[PDB]
Design an enzyme around this catalytic site. Sequence first.
Site, PDB file in Angstrom:
ATOM      1  N   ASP A  67     -26.308   7.835 -18.602  1.00  0.00           N
ATOM      2  CA  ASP A  67     -26.362   9.035 -17.756  1.00  0.00           C
ATOM      3  C   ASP A  67     -26.570   8.702 -16.271  1.00  0.00           C
ATOM      4  O   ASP A  67     -27.195   9.454 -15.519  1.00  0.00           O
ATOM      5  CB  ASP A  67     -27.443  10.004 -18.265  1.00  0.00           C
ATOM      6  CG  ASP A  67     -28.827   9.364 -18.365  1.00  0.00           C
ATOM      7  OD1 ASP A  67     -29.801   9.998 -17.898  1.00  0.00           O
ATOM      8  OD2 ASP A  67     -28.944   8.246 -18.919  1.00  0.00           O
ATOM      9  N   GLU A  87      -0.549  -4.447  -0.572  1.00  0.00           N
ATOM     10  CA  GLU A  87      -0.925  -5.367   0.499  1.00  0.00           C
ATOM     11  C   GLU A  87      -2.018  -4.732   1.341  1.00  0.00           C
ATOM     12  O   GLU A  87      -1.728  -3.994   2.290  1.00  0.00           O
ATOM     13  CB  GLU A  87       0.271  -5.666   1.409  1.00  0.00           C
ATOM     14  CG  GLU A  87       1.595  -5.985   0.708  1.00  0.00           C
ATOM     15  CD  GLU A  87       2.773  -6.119   1.688  1.00  0.00           C
ATOM     16  OE1 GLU A  87       3.686  -6.932   1.401  1.00  0.00           O
ATOM     17  OE2 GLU A  87       2.791  -5.419   2.735  1.00  0.00           O
ATOM     18  N   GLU A 105      -5.002  -4.743   3.972  1.00  0.00           N
ATOM     19  CA  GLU A 105      -5.590  -5.375   5.155  1.00  0.00           C
ATOM     20  C   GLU A 105      -7.039  -4.921   5.321  1.00  0.00           C
ATOM     21  O   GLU A 105      -7.397  -3.829   4.884  1.00  0.00           O
ATOM     22  CB  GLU A 105      -4.782  -5.018   6.411  1.00  0.00           C
ATOM     23  CG  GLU A 105      -3.307  -5.425   6.366  1.00  0.00           C
ATOM     24  CD  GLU A 105      -2.399  -4.543   7.238  1.00  0.00           C
ATOM     25  OE1 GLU A 105      -2.767  -4.291   8.406  1.00  0.00           O
ATOM     26  OE2 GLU A 105      -1.314  -4.115   6.757  1.00  0.00           O
ATOM     27  N   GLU A 151      -2.262 -15.795   2.587  1.00  0.00           N
ATOM     28  CA  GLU A 151      -3.435 -15.454   3.385  1.00  0.00           C
ATOM     29  C   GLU A 151      -2.992 -15.447   4.837  1.00  0.00           C
ATOM     30  O   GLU A 151      -2.563 -16.467   5.359  1.00  0.00           O
ATOM     31  CB  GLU A 151      -4.531 -16.499   3.179  1.00  0.00           C
ATOM     32  CG  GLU A 151      -5.656 -16.461   4.210  1.00  0.00           C
ATOM     33  CD  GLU A 151      -6.306 -17.835   4.462  1.00  0.00           C
ATOM     34  OE1 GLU A 151      -6.949 -18.393   3.537  1.00  0.00           O
ATOM     35  OE2 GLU A 151      -6.191 -18.351   5.604  1.00  0.00           O
ATOM     36  N   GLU A 169      -5.487 -10.299   5.664  1.00  0.00           N
ATOM     37  CA  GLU A 169      -4.765  -9.770   4.502  1.00  0.00           C
ATOM     38  C   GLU A 169      -4.523 -10.891   3.507  1.00  0.00           C
ATOM     39  O   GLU A 169      -4.043 -11.953   3.875  1.00  0.00           O
ATOM     40  CB  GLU A 169      -3.410  -9.178   4.938  1.00  0.00           C
ATOM     41  CG  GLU A 169      -2.587  -8.503   3.826  1.00  0.00           C
ATOM     42  CD  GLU A 169      -1.065  -8.557   4.060  1.00  0.00           C
ATOM     43  OE1 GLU A 169      -0.464  -7.534   4.491  1.00  0.00           O
ATOM     44  OE2 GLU A 169      -0.469  -9.629   3.797  1.00  0.00           O
ATOM     45  N   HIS A 206       0.525  -1.358   2.116  1.00  0.00           N
ATOM     46  CA  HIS A 206       1.898  -1.125   1.676  1.00  0.00           C
ATOM     47  C   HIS A 206       1.986  -1.271   0.168  1.00  0.00           C
ATOM     48  O   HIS A 206       1.655  -2.322  -0.378  1.00  0.00           O
ATOM     49  CB  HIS A 206       2.862  -2.107   2.329  1.00  0.00           C
ATOM     50  CG  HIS A 206       2.641  -2.292   3.794  1.00  0.00           C
ATOM     51  ND1 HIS A 206       2.110  -3.450   4.323  1.00  0.00           N
ATOM     52  CD2 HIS A 206       2.868  -1.463   4.841  1.00  0.00           C
ATOM     53  CE1 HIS A 206       2.024  -3.328   5.635  1.00  0.00           C
ATOM     54  NE2 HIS A 206       2.479  -2.133   5.974  1.00  0.00           N
ATOM     55  N   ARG A 253      10.101  -0.162  10.820  1.00  0.00           N
ATOM     56  CA  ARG A 253       8.715  -0.341  10.409  1.00  0.00           C
ATOM     57  C   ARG A 253       8.025   1.026  10.410  1.00  0.00           C
ATOM     58  O   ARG A 253       7.082   1.266   9.647  1.00  0.00           O
ATOM     59  CB  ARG A 253       8.002  -1.328  11.350  1.00  0.00           C
ATOM     60  CG  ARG A 253       7.101  -2.357  10.649  1.00  0.00           C
ATOM     61  CD  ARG A 253       7.911  -3.522  10.061  1.00  0.00           C
ATOM     62  NE  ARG A 253       8.172  -4.575  11.045  1.00  0.00           N
ATOM     63  CZ  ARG A 253       9.173  -5.458  10.977  1.00  0.00           C
ATOM     64  NH1 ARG A 253      10.043  -5.428   9.965  1.00  0.00           N
ATOM     65  NH2 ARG A 253       9.304  -6.374  11.935  1.00  0.00           N
ATOM     66  N   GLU A 291       8.892  -0.102  -1.057  1.00  0.00           N
ATOM     67  CA  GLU A 291       7.593  -0.292  -0.394  1.00  0.00           C
ATOM     68  C   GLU A 291       7.191   0.968   0.370  1.00  0.00           C
ATOM     69  O   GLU A 291       7.821   1.316   1.365  1.00  0.00           O
ATOM     70  CB  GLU A 291       7.662  -1.511   0.553  1.00  0.00           C
ATOM     71  CG  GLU A 291       6.414  -1.801   1.426  1.00  0.00           C
ATOM     72  CD  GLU A 291       6.595  -2.963   2.435  1.00  0.00           C
ATOM     73  OE1 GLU A 291       5.577  -3.537   2.892  1.00  0.00           O
ATOM     74  OE2 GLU A 291       7.746  -3.308   2.789  1.00  0.00           O
ATOM     75  N   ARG A 343       4.801   2.724   2.792  1.00  0.00           N
ATOM     76  CA  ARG A 343       4.006   2.104   3.866  1.00  0.00           C
ATOM     77  C   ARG A 343       2.943   2.997   4.509  1.00  0.00           C
ATOM     78  O   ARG A 343       2.180   2.544   5.358  1.00  0.00           O
ATOM     79  CB  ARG A 343       4.931   1.560   4.965  1.00  0.00           C
ATOM     80  CG  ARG A 343       5.816   0.405   4.534  1.00  0.00           C
ATOM     81  CD  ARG A 343       6.761  -0.047   5.650  1.00  0.00           C
ATOM     82  NE  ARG A 343       6.068  -0.766   6.723  1.00  0.00           N
ATOM     83  CZ  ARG A 343       5.711  -2.051   6.683  1.00  0.00           C
ATOM     84  NH1 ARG A 343       5.964  -2.810   5.617  1.00  0.00           N
ATOM     85  NH2 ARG A 343       5.087  -2.583   7.726  1.00  0.00           N
TER      86      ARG A 343
END
Lengths: 463, 467, 239, 464
Positions: free
Chosen positions: A51, A118, A120, A204, A212, A261, A332, A351, A353
């Site tokens: 609980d 992805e 960041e 990386e 990221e 993304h 973009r 993707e 974004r």
Amino acid sequence: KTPDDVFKLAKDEKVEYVDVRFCDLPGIMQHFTIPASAFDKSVFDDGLAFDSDMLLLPDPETARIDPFRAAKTLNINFFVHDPFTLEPYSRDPRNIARKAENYLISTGIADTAYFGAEAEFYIFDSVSFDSRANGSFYEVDAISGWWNTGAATEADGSPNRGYKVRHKGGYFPVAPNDQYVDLRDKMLTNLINSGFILEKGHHEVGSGGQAEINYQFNSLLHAADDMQLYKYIIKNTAWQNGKTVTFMPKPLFGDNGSGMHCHQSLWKDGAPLMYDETGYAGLSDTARHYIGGLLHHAPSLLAFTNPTVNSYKRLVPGYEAPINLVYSQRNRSACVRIPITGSNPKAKRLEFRSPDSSGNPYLAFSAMLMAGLDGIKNKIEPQAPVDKDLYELPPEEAASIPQTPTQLSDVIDRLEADHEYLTEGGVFTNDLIETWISFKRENEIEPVNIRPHPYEFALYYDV
Amino acid sequence: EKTPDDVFKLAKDEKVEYVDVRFCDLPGIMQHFTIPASAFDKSVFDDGLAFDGHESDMLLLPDPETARIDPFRAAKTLNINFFVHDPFTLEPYSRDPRNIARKAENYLISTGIADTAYFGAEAEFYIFDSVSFDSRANGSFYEVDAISGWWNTGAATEADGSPNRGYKVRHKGGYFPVAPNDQYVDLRDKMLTNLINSGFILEKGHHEVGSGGQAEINYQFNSLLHAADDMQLYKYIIKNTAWQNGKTVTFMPKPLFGDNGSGMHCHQSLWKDGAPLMYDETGYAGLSDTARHYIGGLLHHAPSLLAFTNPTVNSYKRLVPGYEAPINLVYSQRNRSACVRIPITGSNPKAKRLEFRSPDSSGNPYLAFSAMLMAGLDGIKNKIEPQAPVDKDLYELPPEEAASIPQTPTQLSDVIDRLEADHEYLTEGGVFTNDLIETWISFKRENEIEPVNIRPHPYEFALYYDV
Amino acid sequence: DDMQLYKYIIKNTAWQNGKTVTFMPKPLFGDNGSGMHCHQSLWKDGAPLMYDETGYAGLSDTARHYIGGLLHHAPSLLAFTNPTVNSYKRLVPGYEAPINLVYSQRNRSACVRIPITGSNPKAKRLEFRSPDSSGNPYLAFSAMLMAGLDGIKNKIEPQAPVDKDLYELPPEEAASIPQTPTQLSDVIDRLEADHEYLTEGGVFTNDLIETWISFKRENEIEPVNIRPHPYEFALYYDV
Amino acid sequence: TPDDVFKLAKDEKVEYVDVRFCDLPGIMQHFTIPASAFDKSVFDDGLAFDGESDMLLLPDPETARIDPFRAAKTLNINFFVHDPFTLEPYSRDPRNIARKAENYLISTGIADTAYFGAEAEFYIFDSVSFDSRANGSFYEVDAISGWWNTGAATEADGSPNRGYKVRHKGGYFPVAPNDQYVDLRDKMLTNLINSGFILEKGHHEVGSGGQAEINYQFNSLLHAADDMQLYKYIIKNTAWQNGKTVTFMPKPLFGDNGSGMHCHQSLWKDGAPLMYDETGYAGLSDTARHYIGGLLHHAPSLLAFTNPTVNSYKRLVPGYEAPINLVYSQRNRSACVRIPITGSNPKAKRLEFRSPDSSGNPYLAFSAMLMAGLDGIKNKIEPQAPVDKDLYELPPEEAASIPQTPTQLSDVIDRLEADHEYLTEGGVFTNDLIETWISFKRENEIEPVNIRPHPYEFALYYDV
Ligand SMILES: O=c1nc2c(n3ccnc13)=Cc1c(-c3ccccc3)cccc1-2
Ligand SMILES: O=c1nc2c(n3ccnc13)=Cc1c(-c3ccccc3)cccc1-2
Ligand SMILES: O=c1nc2c(n3ccnc13)=Cc1c(-c3ccccc3)cccc1-2
Ligand SMILES: O=c1nc2c(n3ccnc13)=Cc1c(-c3ccccc3)cccc1-2
């Protein structure tokens, strides 16, 4: 992935406590700990009470060893069930996700949805903030922060050594400019050790204070579990090494936002559905519709996708932000981009974004999948792609490019009006959406809205 | 040179856990991302790696030569420099500094003048303990400091509370005194070790020299492209050796006022079918017909050349009319105030080279080295004859007999204009594109020249507040 | 004389009330500059020589030539007009500062702007807007008038006046307008080249002008140039 | 009269004259000329300046006041901006817009005078500081009397903490020593009466902790706006001169009162009031009714001039029941428009618009209100039923039909951008002026606040 497997891990590693984990609605994990002895067969079939009251049933797939706990601990995620009816609790995000995977199975369109995100994040040495009657403030800091350029000496007295200024030419400079190399190493190690897969396009990346790491995709529910795990390991690795991480969309003013993304694709009988050499960008009609679903529902999708007030300081008409409601291969600034993969059908994905890491990943990935399935089930056609840059085109020809709403209060308003596509298959229930709407208005939207902005004084004290 | 296979050997013997993907930005600051060791298979050398920075997406191809184990990362990391290509066409990016040097090295061959252009650059730097600076609306400041700085003779205690122990002031006599005046000995040796272990070759005319805060280490030559690769690595290693010992390094042309500049001297030579061209006793100094024509090319092109060899606004606080700074366009055997300077090679054929004295380390070694070789070649094509050498002094010789000794331009905004007005020898062979140069002209104007030009200098207050 | 007085009184009133004043042309970066807007006319036998209704902007044929003399000698006139290094941090292409070597009645961006004075023959004059209070008002006025005269004597005709906007007029159509030099070292080099309109009548001597040049070079241009700017560290310490 | 002012200048041995005029958002601008330079030729020919290029400045004799703060004896007068060639009132000078409104009001024959009285609240602090950097942002106001200081060990200047601070239950306007600013407010009132403000029956100085208000007599539209400007100037400076600092900003304090400006309006013709009718509601003629009809109809855009700041909408929130309800009442403080109890006296009869705040430009605020009021008459716009019962305590489905004002500056700007004919009528407001005002507010206020993180966002989301 078999209860018996988890029991092997428990023994090989000599586990002594198990961390039972579960997810609150706005998406911060919750935990308590039982001793290893108390964890057995009966846990997987009956569940654990706790609980108001809840029965918790475990997902064998999510078992991980905790890198950070001094005692040797195995963490497992659980689905929340009602103790009386034994039936999956309606507002458990891990369940909202599981019903979404299952709805996709019933439609008969595909059998598995693959998500890859992805995410960041910022690294700071410290943060403090505070709201009072007569004042308000916040301040983040970090040694390498470009605003510490004329610092007498550092936080701990040691001399100011320079190499801070966010410079021109690139975004990702080598050390000593890259002042958090060894930290991200530790993070990546801890991710690799906690079973994250890193292959081809996975790396990386580190842009001064912002970083990221991306890992391999997964099936919708488990992709979200990975996403909560990533956050957990990233946050705690910084914590354990004297720093402080935030996934918040926009902590630094006049610098980059922290996006997420999301890559999605659909598979059935073990084959990809998104590829077609003949269509635009190598996209099949199934894919094209899906995109059309995302762009149609974007206005209400952003409620789960970008669900904080802070989210709309990143998604603002200015920065070349993913707020333009079209799909592209170049732009973009477009909402949906398509990664250039080539003739390989297995990689062909789309993707999205706009999202950020501030959301509940379970509701986000679901909300996206629901929107996309709507596109497929209604054969929605997305308005044609936009490949040439958006900043250079007539103000009238580019006025046909619709926008995402630019406020939390708006996307929440929109979710209220059209949320039908989400109720399909009993995934998001009309109850839960009322709650999500109330929760945001009562605890976020309006408590921010009644508090004067520091900058308002800049503008208005003089009036 | 070493093949891909040796790289997978190095990685394996060293137990590398991560691989560092390095590539160069336009002004010449290395960029990197890190991928796990296991993700670094042979497909990297064949298919390449994708990433995104008009351009958007980019394919990156490894150079087997530049593989080196990072000494500084805690995690075992191998670093490799990459070439930028067009993902679709496999075409080198016309704005990738390493590509540009690649083109340079091929072009040289496409002319049959030689097969190899060698460089080797003695690059100078400063070691400080601290640097701070900042630009505001109502004021500006900068301040470097270091313990051994002469402006600290009167200090009561040092920064760490410790007593002041003297042995600071720059003296009269020589430039390179021994300890305790040389306070930076252990740090310089540490730098040397790191460069030795990172694979640099130290032999004959190769040494570690320490003039107060200023220091320099020279290492073995290399073919144009790989010389520039070495040049980067060299900065990286100095910088990061300092950093891990709690100091701070800088390669900027002139960090200290009324004191020495940081300068990078580039020795050029050319070779063909295994033999040196430059040598020939029967001509002046040891110089061949080609060597001379090369020298001519440097001298005729200098005003635009500097745009790549001496890029920054700060480059022209070193190159000032007076300091005996290499602004004079003549070649020599004795003059430190001469652009080109033939070193005493003791007439053995192989060591015959020529040292350019003007450029500083504040540049892009790829472009610099490339544009230098480009100038030198155009000088060979049109058999360009350089005005008579100067062996007698420049400081002291009739004022109107040496009036017609021409001067390099002394500003940045100046040299860029020479570049915007004459850049053919650079675009020869497509080595430099016209598009590249146009942007580097624009860089530069917007990002360096103009923002400096519009900010008041502190000294303008010394001069004018009272007016 | 009034100008030197004004300055003195301004400075001292502040100083006497615990403050500090400056006429340096650009003390704050990214804020306004302090300029000196100079109005000029010529008069004969107690009656003005500048007015004429049938000419442009109410100018006479004297007034127009006078203007031509200013604009032709501006590249050198500035060496007295705008004689400090700090002046060119005000007269830089950007803020649309008065650098464009044209005349107007509209423009804030042109060296000479004619003050709207309508139908009064006495009040017609020309406002030369480039100067700053960092100079010598004695030598600066002098050289303005001297250049103005070489314009009348030789009858120099200045290119067409522009009332139209200098901030927005086609990129190649207005690429035909000369700018002032953008550096003290420049206007000095250009005074050394031509300074004849100054030595006419023996007003300025070849000697004086030669000192001024050596004064500006060895005491101002060279000492600023050899000293590193703080923003250079912002730009380059990282290289 | 022009001549009054010259005798004023003479009698008071004036040495400087302050030429004043209103900038677009609403702060007065000025330059000073010597008294020697101020003669008959000023009122006839004008005065030349620049802000577009060169402008002519013509003085309004009515606005002439001795400046009580300047040590040099100085006379302040407001001016109207004109074009030097044409002699045309400038399209954009708020004072002309107010003038032009007053004339259009005559041109319709509806009334000849429009009376405006304003009750503008303000705040008194001892200090304000703030700023907005890349990694941080803050603000803080402080006042010794402030209820957040109860636990302070000493004051700012070191002297001991004497108490009598906290907002207490039962009363908004306590006597001293709780009323810590009594002597300051007095000085304020003295300075207004000295500066030619008229105080009579319903006019009084009130003081609520650190917030304060002083009313003065009505005036005709343009002069009312002038008075409002003046009132601000004297309040601000009277505090400034006494080491305090004042703000007219709608909402300086989170979790406390907002400062509002209540705008009392009425119309007159041939010296007879047009607002009274003993046949109800609240003794209101159809003229008065249609006026209200227009106010309430155009309120969604009128606010872009009445409440024209991003701060304005921290006061106007669906919270404390701020005046956002699109109804007129006699009871509810939560109604946009309200009728003050005047009873039978036909001259006191007016209507109080309660939404506005003093963060405005009163020339534009007042003009915009009247313009909206006339469109109400000319179009016989009928306003929805008057609500006399409680707005906060009534059946939820019968109170759901009560419309609200927009809650955000971004909205009202857009609502104004949609329909704004009622403003452009007669050429009072030009499409040109309204457009600039939109660009102005959008790019200078709406957009800059938007892109700057809010400190409470870090509270909500750092841990996400
Ligand atoms: O063999 C595969 N290869 C891939 C894959 N997948 C799902 C199931 N089996 C596979 C999924 C996949 C992606 C992908 C698809 C959607 C979202 C994120 C990554 C990208 C590259 C390669 C693959
Ligand atoms: O044996 C050699 N010895 C030398 C050399 N080289 C290139 C190829 N093989 C050789 C190149 C070389 C230089 C040299 C040439 C150009 C630039 C800098 C140094 C100086 C001394 C000795 C040598
Ligand atoms: O009555 C006069 N009015 C003026 C004048 N002047 C000179 C001799 N007498 C007069 C000179 C004058 C100027 C003026 C002319 C040149 C430079 C500065 C001001 C401007 C306005 C009005 C006058
Ligand atoms: O006698 C009068 N009495 C009043 C008045 N007025 C205007 C012209 N003549 C009068 C205006 C007036 C108001 C009033 C009207 C509108 C706004 C504020 C106050 C209130 C009470 C009494 C009066």
